[PDB]
Design a binder for this molecule. Structure first.
Ligand SMILES: [Cl-]
Lengths: 250, 241, 195, 235, 243, 240, 231, 244, 111
């Protein structure tokens, strides 16, 4: 046995292209649309819960994931690749930061660690790149609210608002017209729902849409009292009912 | 064209080895079905013993992973047993480390992660199997979670797997459209098994003897498989109404 | 080995090191030079456990000479002393530590200043106007505390050094067979052949 | 591509057979064994007149009682020589005696097939190992990159090998003197060499029981060349 | 195409052609069988006499694992030996930790997982043998047959090699005509007959018969070779049936 | 680890990877070595395609291995650094254990051995570098000049050139260099080295580098003006 | 064709071509004969020379006082395998104070050769061996093939033109097996057997190589004028 | 086995070129242009962000200019993810040197170390090379202000003015034309921006499409200050030089 | 604490003649004040006309003799059945003994 694939499976072609990364991006293009919008007092990330079967319980499959109490993530592309990246992202947030500094990492640095893992799968021996693009929304004390995109190459860019996957070209155009620097969180959620409706074919409701926010601290979700400096997670996943309420004022 | 031999991306962004592993899943030509009751989860599967020289007691695609978790496999038996042995080891290790029984959905995720690794690492091939895990979870209640060679997994109200999965799937879909509930409203597991067999008969359009079926049942704190005589009793009850 | 002394004056650093090598009840040698030139303007004297002393000194010498060739440039005394300290600090938590104490006397050509560093086997570094290792300092520091002025000449430094050696020859029980004296200044390193 | 340790349909290792082709391109080396000693001679073959020919070292001492000549990719021989020298000296340390020539050759040949995917390829050099011991007397061995070694009364390797070997076939007999062997190596070297043979582009050596292994001076070889010319002109 | 050039590669069918090619090596080998009886199992194999120079009864093919399991195989003989060596290591570590001798179903999976592991990588070749094995444990008699894919099942009767079809037909008759069961001594006689009948597929060269058995009554649940009078009795019975 | 055999034999008995490494040397800028009676001179070509360069900080072509030995090269620049570093480490290691600096032959044999090792080790390619190693042995006044190449063979040279258009300058040296009477002085040796480069270089401005090595660790690199004086004198004599 | 690049690849008909190519190397090798009676076992080997100046390549190797073999094919591979046998014989003696059974020695060689036929990177051994020995169950003769197949025989031959000697032994089977307590007559039969594989060349004093082991006879090799008696 | 799928990333072509290095350089030639200009009283680093969007958060963005320590900075051309791997290694190397010698690392030593790492990937390991070219801008007390470049081959060279990435041929010609030795930072700032403005593939050069930095002794007395320009500060210098 | 060494007593004696040599040893084997055996051979024929005895701790003694006998066997295999001379045997035994310099064979050896 032994892993005898100690050589790179991603290489430069004569034209200077890294084929496997380009092909990974093509897989992301086929993936379901997801988006992120940044407001003054928060960030929103959203996507469609494309259920593979009506017998399948789509609540058990979480496309939007908590990484830290103040950082969340959504994707477009290959779901299994995303799932393992979330596991690694959650762990690296502890091993490479929290166990050293006694606090959760700022958004940009956690993104940087995730980006590193994806870059290594582009150069290390006997592996293919991750077939996903991530959108990571988060908050920290000194940088405030932020939104980042991470691609299969490991490259990451900060966005005011963006979309990835199936109908990203049209969705990004829609966001350019609506976005401004004076948006409140509720306005961003409203715009997120409008943008996402264009790329969805079938049912459009709280049960088929997954949406989470990075906003105010939630002391009710902390689970304990007695420490003033601990005020609760800024990450919150919106319920099916909470989404439907905002679809009436749509 | 070596992008079709190992698990790397094709120009279309596809993994052909994963797709071909899905096709190996139907090599046995067996159909399986899983449904949830109030207090139970039932899984049934076709049993085919073509050779008379075979010992029919040893021919099985249902596995007792732990006391609480059962697993039915769609695919070749070597890969099925590979997956079964690993799931048993993982379930045992989980209990030792974390002090409680491994949940059905957590085991499904773990096995799905292992499958994901085979789709990303070149030296390991995907297993040509679909794994349907069943239990009565102490927190979530009756549970059905299914894993495939892509590393995908999800919970189910009910599910079906095999060559004629679509016929079974639609049959189940139409039932749950009428009842408007996420399970079989029935007290005893015996009647849930009868439902499962009845709807497989209707969907496939074939009658079954006691030796044509294989049944697994999950209740609170134990999973068990039915004998040929237990299934016979089940078939008699169906015929008498 | 036994006694190593150092004194930094106006424009130079002077290192004095005993010539005796004793094993048991015999003085095997009375002309031993307990020092190595690390670079043209940096000298290191040493004392400690037998074997370890020379092995360590020559190891450091090789590393500094390697640096000099690679960069075509002489490291500052401060840089060399920091390198040496790290090696000893690394060594003290090894399986078998280097049991060696050193003085590093160098002339920094950039700042045009003499510099004396005292480092023990634990990796304890201090920059000093005058220094010593072992039981030497128990005698010599009181004399140096009295006489040493920072603007002394090299000749005045040697006279003050003679007063230290005379005191050691009077009050120390061991016959260390005199000292080899070396001067480190802007022109490089030279040995005082009559002392 | 294909494995490095692959067999051909004829039952030969591709890489070993290909290394033998590299040896055919190498400069000529000749060895002749007699009852008075073993002679080793080589063609230096300088690529340019500015190359100082005395720096060309294709004849090499392994021990006092064992010498070695090479042909082919001569750079590959250095680790083989180092191993031979170490094996010779190590055996003396362990057993307080000289090592047998055959045993030394066997030790060198054990390296040959240690290649795969150990070193990445076979050696591209053949060796003529000559020496003396008390048991089997004066001996000459031909060590190949296949791991095989044959003992020889006389042997030529390199570019002019088959032509030289045919000449050695006729000339060699069991009563040859050392002087006769020296001239015979020079004669055959001169025959197969491209450039005209002299003391600067050809080198002689021998191994005797008394004096051990000795590389010949250019002055000593020059006399033997002059002695050769006269005896050929004599008839 | 090119899917058949490397082990562990799925073809567009979902097949591993390298394993299917290993089966061809098995089909090329001599005939070997297994018969499950009332309180044990019987193994028999065809040994082709390539030459008169072969020493009779010396080149033993059937192998014992632990003291209660018998193993026989068809195909590449060295591959079978490698598999049995592993089986012996598996059985030893089981007995070392758990004290009791390894159960036959437990033993079957140990071989199965090991053979299956040789279909997971291109750095290894699949096994070129189908192995028939079994014995007696606490739960009674068990007979198994294991393929190059790692696939195995329990059997009432098993056969593999060049004369497998002929053998299988004969085994199927015994299952039908003996629902209540077959005795150990009967199974030895029947085993001899089936090998002789299966020899029609290898009729060019003459052969040597080799039989072994594990039985709770006849051998105290230990694996033993059929020797001397009992072997000759089985040969005579076999020779009588073909004529 | 990556163990792939990259350097292997071909049917005609050639190791193409070693031969293709020589082609990389052929592409490299020209380097020349000439030894006089009491000195050795190392000449090197600087291609003038690269202007706006900072000549203070740009890696020089001639590298000191020790105070008494120097190394120039032709081929891949990045590869040369690895050989130079190893050579420098080995030089200090030799001084440490033998208590004597390396001979020029020993240092050459070491560098050549490293190059050879990379022609039959798994997972590595050969060095695309040929070197000229020159200097004087400790307490010795006999000049030394050696050459190495990717295969690992090495040899001593009265005068030698490597790199692009080395065939031309070797042609020049073969007719102009006399063994019975080599360049007696430093001037004569430098002049012959500059002359040989002028057959190939193009312009004699900043395209020629000269380094003179003398006995007892006396090494110095000539400046632009000093070299320009040689270039001026050569062409003025040529106009006749 | 497409399935002979390495040892880890079956062909469509279930063949291992690299193993078969290794088998071919044996057929190119010089002839060697093995035969035995109830008391003694004999190896006879036709040694091959490169040319008239060269020596005749040794064919027979001693493994223990009671066991040894003759080779045909790649000689270095025979050295590796014989070295392994020496060690295994030696392990049996040191640990168990027990002379290694010839049958068990064959089993160990089979398993060693097998590992090289199933793993990637390596290669099959390119040599065939004839092992003779005298142990607690009398005289033995084994034939080793690098496919892994080991066979116990009364007599056999391997190498080029080995079919001629093998046919002779097949006729003489009943005669030479009965040669008990007479080593010279058993060797005579072996020398007469190997003679059936000769063409053009004949058995000379430095060409022939003989070895014998028996009841009160340690494994000894005869070369040079020691075999002139049998020419 | 696995050999079948090995691309062999560390081999020579028949012409004596390293395939993967050459193809990596082709990749870098499509990256945003980065320019470095060294003056007597400082160094300028200018770089063009690639086809940005209006919704890109610029003030928190960094794809071109990175800080290695207080004295040394780099401009990136190529794969940003590859560059960050090397940048973090370089930052560690600088700190290792500072811990060992208690002095800031000389620029060339840092450059050589990174260049050696790149070289290793071209000779052994069987991995693809880093698709990155750096412009190093730094200062030390030995050589003063220094500009270097390194590329995937691991070869590095010193420069007075240099460009990497796209349109280097056109950019280098323009720099070679207007550069002089007695030039100052303020003039070098203007030259850098003018060169980008002419070589750019975009319709017009704007503040949102640029990253800019200077290394000045323009710090209070004998010391060196690194200035990574903010979006508003890039907008102001564009108006000052008369481009917008 | 476990003591890996013991003392089995006994005594040996070697005398070299002009054309002969003798190696003698008593046959008693003991621990403390008890007799283990009245006849336990201590001097051994190791082949090649060499006799050997390793007196002291019998377990180490037997181990050493066993390893030297082994060395003689492999000397024949590796060097064409060459006779191991007494001087060569002596040097070989030095390396066997010094190989365990930091966990010695607790014996006095005579050949
Ligand atoms: Cl996991």
């Amino acid at each position: 046995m032994t892993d005898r694939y100690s050589f790179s499976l991603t290489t430069f072609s004569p034209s200077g292209k890294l084929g496997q990364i380009d092909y990974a991006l093509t897989a992301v293009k086929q993936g379901v649309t997801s988006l992120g919008i940044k407001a003054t007092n928060g960030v929103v990330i959203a996507t469609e819960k494309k259920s593979s079967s009506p017998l399948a319980m789509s609540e058990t499959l979480s496309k939007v994931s908590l990484l830290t109490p103040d950082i969340g993530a959504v994707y477009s592309g290959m779901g299994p690749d995303y799932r393992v990246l979330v596991d690694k992202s959650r762990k690296v947030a502890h091993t490479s930061y929290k166990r050293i500094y006694g606090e959760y990492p700022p958004t940009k640095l956690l993104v940087s660690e995730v980006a590193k893992i994806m870059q290594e799968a582009t150069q290390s021996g006997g592996v293919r790149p991750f077939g996903v693009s991530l959108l990571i929304a988060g908050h920290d004390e000194f940088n405030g609210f932020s939104l980042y995109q991470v691609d299969p190459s490991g490259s990451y860019f900060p966005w005011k608002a963006t979309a990835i996957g199936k109908g990203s070209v049209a969705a990004k155009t829609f966001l350019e017209k609506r976005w401004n620097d004076e948006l409140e969180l509720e306005d961003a959620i409203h715009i997120a729902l409008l943008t996402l409706k264009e790329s969805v074919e079938g049912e459009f409701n709280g049960d088929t849409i997954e949406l989470a926010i990075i906003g105010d601290e939630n002391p009710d979700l902390l689970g304990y009292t007695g420490i003033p400096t601990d005020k609760g997670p800024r990450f919150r996943k919106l319920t099916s009912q909470e989404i439907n309420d905002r679809l009436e004022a749509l | 064209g070596y992008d079709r031999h190992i698990t790397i991306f094709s120009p279309e962004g596809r993994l052909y080895q994963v797709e071909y592993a899905f096709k190996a899943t139907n090599q046995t030509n067996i159909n399986s079905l899983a449904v949830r009751g109030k207090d139970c989860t039932v899984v049934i599967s076709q049993k085919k013993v073509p050779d008379k020289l075979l010992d029919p007691t040893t021919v099985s695609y249902i596995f007792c992973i732990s006391r609480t978790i059962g697993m039915v496999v769609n695919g070749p038996i070597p890969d099925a047993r590979n997956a079964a042995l690993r799931a048993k080891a993982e379930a045992a290790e989980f209990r030792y480390k974390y002090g409680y029984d491994m949940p059905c959905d957590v085991l499904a995720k773990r096995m799905a992660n292992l499958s994901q690794i085979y789709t990303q690492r070149a030296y390991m091939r995907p297993l040509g199997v679909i794994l349907t895990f069943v239990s009565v979870d102490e927190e979530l209640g009756p549970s059905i979670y299914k894993t495939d060679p892509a590393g995908y997994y999800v919970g189910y109200k009910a599910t079906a797997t095999g060559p004629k999965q679509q016929e079974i799937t639609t049959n189940l879909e139409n039932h749950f459209k009428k009842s408007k509930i996420d399970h079989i409203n029935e007290e005893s597991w015996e009647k849930v098994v009868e439902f499962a067999i009845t709807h497989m008969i209707d969907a496939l359009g074939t009658e079954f003897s006691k030796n044509d079926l294989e049944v697994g049942v999950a209740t609170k704190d134990k999973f068990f498989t039915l004998s040929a005589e237990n299934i016979e009793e089940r078939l008699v009850a169906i015929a008498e109404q | 080995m036994d006694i190593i002394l150092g004194i930094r004056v106006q424009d130079s650093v002077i290192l004095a090191s005993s010539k005796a090598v004793t094993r048991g009840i015999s003085v095997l040698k009375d002309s031993d030079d307990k020092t190595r030139q690390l670079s043209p303007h940096t000298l290191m004297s040493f004392a400690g456990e037998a074997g370890d002393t020379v092995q360590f000194a020559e190891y450091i010498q090789a590393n500094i000479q390697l640096y000099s060739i690679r960069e075509d440039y002489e490291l500052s005394p401060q840089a060399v002393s920091s390198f040496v300290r790290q090696e000893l600090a690394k060594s003290i938590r090894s399986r078998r530590p280097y049991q060696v104490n050193v003085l590093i006397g160098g002339y920094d050509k950039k700042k045009n200043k003499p510099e004396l560093y005292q480092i023990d086997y634990l990796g304890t570094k201090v920059e000093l106007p005058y220094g010593a290792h072992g039981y030497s300092g128990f005698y010599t520091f009181s004399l140096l505390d009295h006489h040493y002025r920072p603007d002394m000449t090299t000749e005045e430094g040697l006279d003050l050094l003679k007063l230290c050696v005379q005191e050691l020859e009077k009050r120390m029980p061991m016959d260390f067979k005199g000292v080899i004296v070396k001067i480190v200044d802007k022109d490089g390193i030279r040995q005082v052949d009559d002392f | 591509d294909r494995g490095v340790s692959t067999f051909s349909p004829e039952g030969r290792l591709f890489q070993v057979e290909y290394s033998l082709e590299a040896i055919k391109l190498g400069s000529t080396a000749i060895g002749i064994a007699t009852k008075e000693g073993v002679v080793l001679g080589v063609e230096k073959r300088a690529t340019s007149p500015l190359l100082e020919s005395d720096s060309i070292e294709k004849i090499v001492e392994i021990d006092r009682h064992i010498g070695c000549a090479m042909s082919g990719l001569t750079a590959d021989a250095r680790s083989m020589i180092e191993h031979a020298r170490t094996a010779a000296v190590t055996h003396n340390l362990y057993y307080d005696e000289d090592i047998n020539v055959e045993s030394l050759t066997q030790s060198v040949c054990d390296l040959a097939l240690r290649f795969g995917e150990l070193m990445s390829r076979p050696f591209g050099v053949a060796l003529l190992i000559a020496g003396h011991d008390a048991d089997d007397g004066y001996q000459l061995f031909h060590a190949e990159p296949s791991g095989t070694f044959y003992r020889y009364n006389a042997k030529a390797i390199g570019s002019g090998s088959e032509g030289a070997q045919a000449e050695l076939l006729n000339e060699w007999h069991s009563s040859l003197t050392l002087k006769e062997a020296e001239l015979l190596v020079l004669k055959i070297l001169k025959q197969v060499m491209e450039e005209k043979l002299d003391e600067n582009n050809a080198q002689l050596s021998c191994i005797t029981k008394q004096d051990g292994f000795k590389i010949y001076d250019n002055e000593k070889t020059a006399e033997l060349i002059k002695e050769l010319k006269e005896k050929e002109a004599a008839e | 195409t090119g899917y058949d050039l490397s082990n562990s590669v799925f073809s567009p069918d979902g097949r591993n052609f390298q394993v299917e090619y290993a089966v061809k090596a098995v089909e090329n080998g001599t005939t070997s069988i297994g018969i499950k009886c009332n309180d044990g199992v019987v193994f028999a194999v065809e040994k082709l006499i390539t030459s008169k120079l072969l020493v009779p009864q010396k080149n033993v093919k059937i192998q014992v694992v632990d003291r209660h399991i018998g193993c026989v195989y068809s195909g590449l003989i060295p591959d079978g030996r490698h598999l049995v060596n592993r089986g012996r290591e598996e059985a030893a570590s089981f007995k070392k930790l758990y004290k009791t001798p390894i159960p036959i179903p437990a033993f079957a999976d140990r071989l199965g997982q090991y053979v299956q592991a040789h279909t997971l990588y291109n750095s290894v070749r699949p096994f070129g043998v189908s192995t028939i094995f079994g014995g007696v444990d606490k739960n009674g008699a068990h007979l198994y047959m294991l393929e190059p894919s790692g696939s195995y099942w329990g059997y009432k009767g098993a056969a593999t090699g060049k004369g497998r079809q002929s053998a299988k037909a004969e085994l199927e008759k015994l299952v039908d005509h003996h629902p209540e069961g077959l005795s150990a001594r009967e199974a030895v006689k029947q085993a001899a007959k089936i090998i002789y009948l299966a020899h029609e597929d290898n009729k060019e060269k003459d052969f040597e018969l080799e039989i072994s058995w594990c039985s709770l009554s006849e051998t105290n649940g230990l694996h033993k070779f059929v020797k001397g009078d009992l072997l000759q009795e089985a040969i005579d019975f076999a020779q009588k049936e073909i004529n | 680890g990556y163990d792939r055999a990259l350097s292997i034999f071909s049917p005609d008995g050639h190791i193409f990877q070693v031969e293709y490494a020589l082609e990389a040397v052929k592409r490299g800028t020209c380097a020349v070595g000439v030894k006089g009676k009491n000195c050795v001179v190392l000449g090197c070509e600087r291609r003038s395609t690269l202007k706006l360069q900072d000549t203070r900080i740009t890696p020089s072509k001639v590298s000191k291995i020790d105070s008494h030995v120097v190394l120039s090269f032709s081929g891949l620049n990045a590869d040369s650094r690895i050989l130079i570093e190893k050579a420098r480490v080995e030089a200090q290691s030799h001084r440490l254990t033998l208590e004597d600096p390396v001979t020029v032959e020993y240092l050459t044999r070491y560098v050549a051995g490293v190059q050879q090792r990379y022609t039959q080790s798994g997972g590595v390619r050969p060095f695309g570098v040929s070197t000229l190693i020159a200097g004087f042995d400790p307490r010795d006044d006999e000049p030394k000049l050696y050459q190495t190449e990717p295969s690992g063979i090495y040899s001593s040279w009265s005068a030698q050139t490597i790199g692009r258009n080395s065939k031309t300058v070797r042609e020049f040296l073969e007719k102009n260099y006399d063994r019975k009477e080599p360049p007696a002085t430093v001037e004569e040796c430098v002049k012959l080295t500059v002359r040989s480069l002028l057959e190939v270089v193009q312009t004699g401005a900043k395209n020629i580098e000269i380094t003179v090595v003398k006995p007892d660790s006396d090494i110095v690199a000539l400046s632009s003006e000093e070299i320009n004086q040689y270039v001026t004198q050569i062409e003025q004599e040529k106009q006749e | 064709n497409n399935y002979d690049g390495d040892t880890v690849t079956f062909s469509p008909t279930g063949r291992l071509f690299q193993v078969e190519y290794a088998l071919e190397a044996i057929k190119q090798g010089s002839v060697t004969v093995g035969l035995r009676s109830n008391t003694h076992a004999v190896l006879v080997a036709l040694k091959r020379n490169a040319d008239e100046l060269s020596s005749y390549q040794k064919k027979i190797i001693k493994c223990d006082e009671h066991m040894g073999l003759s080779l045909a094919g790649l000689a270095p591979d025979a050295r590796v395998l014989s070295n392994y046998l020496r060690q295994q014989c030696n392990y049996s003696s040191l640990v168990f104070n027990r002379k290694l059974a010839v049958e068990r020695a064959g089993h160990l060689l089979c398993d060693k050769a097998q590992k090289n036929t199933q793993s990637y990177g390596g290669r099959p051994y390119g040599v065939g061996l004839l092992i003779i020995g005298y142990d607690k169950s009398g005289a033995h003769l084994l034939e080793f093939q690098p496919s892994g197949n080991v066979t116990e025989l009364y007599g056999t031959a391997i190498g080029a033109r080995s079919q001629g000697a093998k046919t002779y032994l097949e006729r003489t089977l009943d005669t030479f097996i009965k040669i008990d307590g007479n080593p010279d007559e058993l060797i005579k039969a072996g020398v007469e057997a190997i003679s059936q594989s000769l063409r053009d060349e004949s058995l000379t004093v430095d060409n022939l190589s003989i070895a014998i082991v028996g009841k009160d006879t340690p494994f000894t090799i005869y070369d040079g004028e020691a075999v002139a008696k049998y020419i | 086995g696995s050999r079948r799928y090995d691309s062999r990333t560390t081999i020579f072509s028949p012409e004596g070129r390293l395939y993967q290095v050459e193809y990596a350089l082709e990749s870098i030639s499509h990256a945003g242009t980065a320019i470095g200009i060294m003056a007597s009283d400082g160094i300028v680093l200018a770089a063009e962000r690639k086809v940005t969007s209006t919704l890109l958060e610029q003030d928190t963005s960094t794809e071109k200019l990175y800080k290695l320590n207080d004295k040394i900075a780099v401009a990136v051309a190529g794969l940003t993810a590859d560059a960050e791997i090397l940048i973090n290694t370089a930052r560690i190397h600088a700190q290792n040197y500072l811990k060992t010698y208690n002095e800031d690392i000389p620029v060339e030593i840092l450059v050589r170390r990174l260049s050696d790492i790149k070289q290793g990937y071209t000779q052994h390991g069987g991995l693809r090379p880093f698709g990155v070219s750096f412009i190093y801008a730094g200062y030390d007390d030995r050589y003063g202000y220094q500009l270097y470049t390194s590329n995937p081959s691991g070869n590095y060279t010193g420069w007075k003015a240099i460009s990497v990435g796209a349109n280097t041929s056109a950019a280098q010609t323009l720099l070679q034309m207007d550069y002089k030795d007695d030039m100052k930072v303020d003039d070098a700032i203007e030259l850098a921006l003018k060169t980008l403005s002419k070589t750019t593939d975009s319709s017009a050069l704007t503040y949102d499409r640029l990253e800019f930095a200077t290394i000045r002794k323009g710090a209070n007395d004998g010391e060196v200050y690194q200035k990574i320009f903010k979006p508003q500060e890039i907008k102001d210098i564009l108006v000052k030089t008369g481009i917008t | 604490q476990f003591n890996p060494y013991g003392d089995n007593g006994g005594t040996i004696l070697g005398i070299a003649g002009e054309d002969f040599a003798v190696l003698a040893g008593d046959t008693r084997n003991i621990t403390d004040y008890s007799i283990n055996s009245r006849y336990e051979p201590k001097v051994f024929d190791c082949g090649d006309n060499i006799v050997m005895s390793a007196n002291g701790f019998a377990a180490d003694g037997d181990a050493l003799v066993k390893r030297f006998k082994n060395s003689v066997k492999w000397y024949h295999f590796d060097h064409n059945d060459k006779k191991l001379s007494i001087n060569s045997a002596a040097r070989n035994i030095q390396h066997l003994l010094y190989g365990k310099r930091f966990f010695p064979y607790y014996v006095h050896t005579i050949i």
